[PDB]
Design a protein around this ligand. Structure first.
Ligand SMILES: [Cl-]
Ligand code: NA
Length: 219
């Protein structure tokens, strides 16, 4: 692909969670062929965010995955025109988010137009109370559902006090160019981490590492 081994990443997120509006900008870099990326996030309006920053972090690009040569890489093949995705984040206590990203490429830079809507989080729950610690490493199941590439994930947020908080992801991924060839069923291992942040999460440094595999026995 004409995707560079070192790409710059620019991002704008506009969102509303439990009626709280915010805008967040991201500036980062990554290595598409190693499945590695890092971003610095700055809240531009609405801060300090009155909910757990962790619900946002997977909305801050499946180009950043190390694909084996024998698995069709839909994401890298979607450039230069790019692709979009839409995701439902359904939490075990009835909280619900819907997020969208339109991803483009202008030379050495990926651009990200992100929308994030969340609602129905209980007032007393770990999201509004900011009791989350991290997402656990996960495995995304990539498959074709009605001719649409779909990733399902059983995610969990570690919380304060030795508790977990479950969230089901379903993401649809659609190339801008038609006739981009759908891949076979496969998996993507993800690890996402807040490397650093300021006390009120006005600034956050984020990292993800992702690697694709066929399943068992292929690793
Ligand atoms: Cl802030
Ligand atoms: Na709160």
């Amino acid at each position: 692909s004409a995707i560079k081994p070192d790409m710059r990443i620019k991002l704008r997120m506009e969102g509303n969670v439990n009626g709280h509006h915010f805008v967040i900008d991201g500036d980062g870099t990554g290595k598409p062929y190693e499945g590695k990326q890092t971003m610095d996030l700055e809240v531009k309006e609405g801060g300090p965010l009155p909910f757990a920053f962790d619900i946002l972090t997977t909305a801050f690009n499946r180009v950043f995955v190390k694909y084996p040569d024998n698995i069709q890489d839909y994401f890298k093949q979607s450039f230069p025109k790019g692709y979009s995705w839409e995701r439902s984040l359904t939490f075990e206590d009835g909280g619900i988010c819907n997020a969208r990203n339109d991803i483009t490429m202008e030379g050495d830079t990926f651009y990200n137009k992100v929308r994030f809507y969340g609602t129905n989080f209980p007032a007393n729950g770990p999201v509004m109370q900011k009791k989350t610690l991290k997402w656990e490493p996960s495995t995304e199941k990539m498959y074709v559902r009605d001719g649409v590439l779909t990733g399902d994930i059983e995610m969990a947020l570690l919380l304060e006090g030795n508790a977990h908080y479950r969230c089901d992801f379903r993401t649809t991924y659609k190339a801008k160019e038609k006739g981009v060839k759908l891949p076979g069923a496969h998996f993507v291992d993800h690890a996402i981490e807040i490397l650093s942040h300021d006390k009120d999460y006005n600034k956050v440094k984020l990292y993800e590492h992702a690697v694709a595999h066929s399943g068992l026995p292929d690793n």
